[PDB]
Nucleic acid binder design. Structure first.
Lengths: 48, 48, 53, 114, 49
RNA sequence: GCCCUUCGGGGCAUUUGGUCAAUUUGAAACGAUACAGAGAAGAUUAGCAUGGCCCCUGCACUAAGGAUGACACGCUACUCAAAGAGACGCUACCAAUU
RNA sequence: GUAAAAAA
């Protein structure tokens, strides 16, 4: 909560920076759908 | 093969009693003393 | 001893899954492994183990 | 405290990693198979009925061999003959499928707990 | 993939698609589910309903 | 260059290779400092395991150790009712002290 | 205090 407050104050007063808590040995679940398993196609079209 | 047709008496006959240990209490529960002494057969034990 | 316990628990569980009739609700089976532990402690203390019901 | 827990989902065996050979794991040993020699059997089938026949022949031979088919100092005292019927133990050895009531365990506890 | 034959899981997935109006996704799931579990009458009843 | 020649000619030998030698911007890691701070339902703690998108030391990828090496301790509707008993429910709202 | 930016 404190870090969020400080980042919001910086973004309000101009400077925007990427506080990145990404450690050593951790995936980026935001970056990509992890271990993505798409639904199997069936007889019905699902493009729409 | 088609599922076995069970009765409510079959369900009751395979329900399992909640185990109260006389030694272990991992969650630190407070168990009522009748429930603590239920599974003891030393109340059953008869001496002639 | 840790390995014997792992093997024993797997054997008792496989027997119980194969003993249970199809269609009984089967979440609480680890409950039976707790009964197995308590029965073993009862044997070590020479206390008769008799769960009502 | 669920740090110390049972195993509900035991580890599944995996295909081996595939790569270049550098690490040395398993030193060669017993690199020749022995095969059954003349006189060592194994690769000698007769027949089902033949094997049956030698089975009852051997078993009947064993059964037939078992059956045999080709004032006084000791009158002062107060208790008398108290060891009759004791030495007559020893007719047949009974295996008992309860370890704590076996004669082996009874012997063990008599020897070691005093 | 972890629970291939779980009726409750199949129903959750089918109902998530139906609740969010993905009717074609849901009917593909219903065909897949009654292919996977053809003696589970719950999935057949859900599909006819 | 050499050799052969019948003086026209012919022969011998035949395609390397490692992104430069250049340190900011194609990826080294401690320590110091700051801070906090060690499992088992009261206190103190011998450990042995379990699972892998956590590894370290080790020849050990068939020891052992690393705090029992750590992690574990959040979260919590969803295969889902039925019976019988009520309901100014579904409309209106109403004329004497002496 | 040795092993993770009038409630030692």
């Amino acid at each position: 909560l404190a870090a969020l407050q400080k980042r919001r104050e910086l973004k309000t007063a101009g400077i925007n920076i990427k506080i990145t808590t990404r450690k050593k040995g951790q995936m980026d679940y935001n970056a990509d759908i992890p271990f993505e398993k798409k639904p199997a196609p069936g007889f019905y079209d699902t493009t729409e | 093969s088609p599922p076995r047709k069970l009765t409510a008496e079959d369900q009751e006959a395979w329900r399992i009693p909640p185990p109260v240990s006389m030694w272990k209490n991992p969650k630190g529960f407070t168990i009522p003393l009748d429930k603590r002494l239920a599974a003891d057969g030393r109340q059953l034990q008869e001496v002639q | 001893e840790s390995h014997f316990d792992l093997e024993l628990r797997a054997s008792v569980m496989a027997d119980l899954m194969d003993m249970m009739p199809e269609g009984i609700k089967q979440s609480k089976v680890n409950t039976v492994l707790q009964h197995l532990s308590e029965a073993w402690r009862c044997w070590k203390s020479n206390i008769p183990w008799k769960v009502p019901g | 405290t669920t740090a110390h827990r049972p195993t509900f989902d035991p580890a599944r065996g995996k295909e081996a990693l595939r790569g270049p050979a550098y690490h040395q794991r398993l030193l060669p040993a017993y690199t020749t198979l022995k095969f059954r020699q003349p006189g060592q059997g194994g690769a000698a089938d007769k027949s089902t009925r033949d094997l049956r026949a030698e089975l009852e022949a051997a078993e009947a031979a064993h059964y037939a061999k078992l059956k045999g088919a080709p004032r006084r100092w000791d009158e002062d005292v107060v208790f008398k003959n108290q060891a009759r019927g004791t030495e007559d133990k020893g007719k047949r050895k009974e295996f008992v499928n309860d370890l704590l009531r076996s004669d082996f365990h009874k012997r063990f506890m008599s020897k070691y707990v005093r | 993939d972890v629970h291939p034959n779980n009726t409750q899981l199949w129903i959750r997935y089918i109902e998530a698609e139906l609740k969010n109006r993905n009717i074609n996704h849901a009917r593909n799931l219903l065909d897949r589910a009654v292919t996977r579990l053809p003696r589970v009458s719950k999935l057949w009843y859900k599909y006819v309903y």
